Write a protein that binds this ligand. Sequence first.
Ligand SMILES: Cc1ccc(C(=O)N2CCN(C(=O)NCC3CC3)CC2)o1
Length: 119
Amino acid sequence: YDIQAWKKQCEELLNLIFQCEDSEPFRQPVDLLEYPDYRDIIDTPMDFATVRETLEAGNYESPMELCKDVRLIFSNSKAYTPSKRSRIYSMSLRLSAFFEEHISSVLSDYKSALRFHKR
Ligand SMILES: Cc1ccc(C(=O)N2CCN(C(=O)NCC3CC3)CC2)o1
């Protein structure tokens, strides 16, 4: 029932994600120089460094907010991909499955802790 525990749990999960080879395309912004049409398709860029920096700045109030930004990394990859069998998109799907597997307890525990608080 620790209302703050999600933050370190998310730091730990981001550490795991940064060690995963599948995260390499998503660790930093799109060199618009290598993908010049990227911002014609993607309205709101997002990367794992921005997520980690937002978390470390204390600019997430809840793990739901972090989860929304991580899911935006994956929806951007799905929107930008020319093919459902594009190398980078395929890496996004594996990393998304890994993230969802790990974030599910973080969200459950946070929401349970907040319910216990306002019991
Ligand atoms: C061909 C294809 C399909 C889907 C995607 C995709 O999701 N992209 C675009 C390319 N990518 C980078 O250029 N990232 C480089 C920074 C990490 C240094 C960002 C993510 O790209």
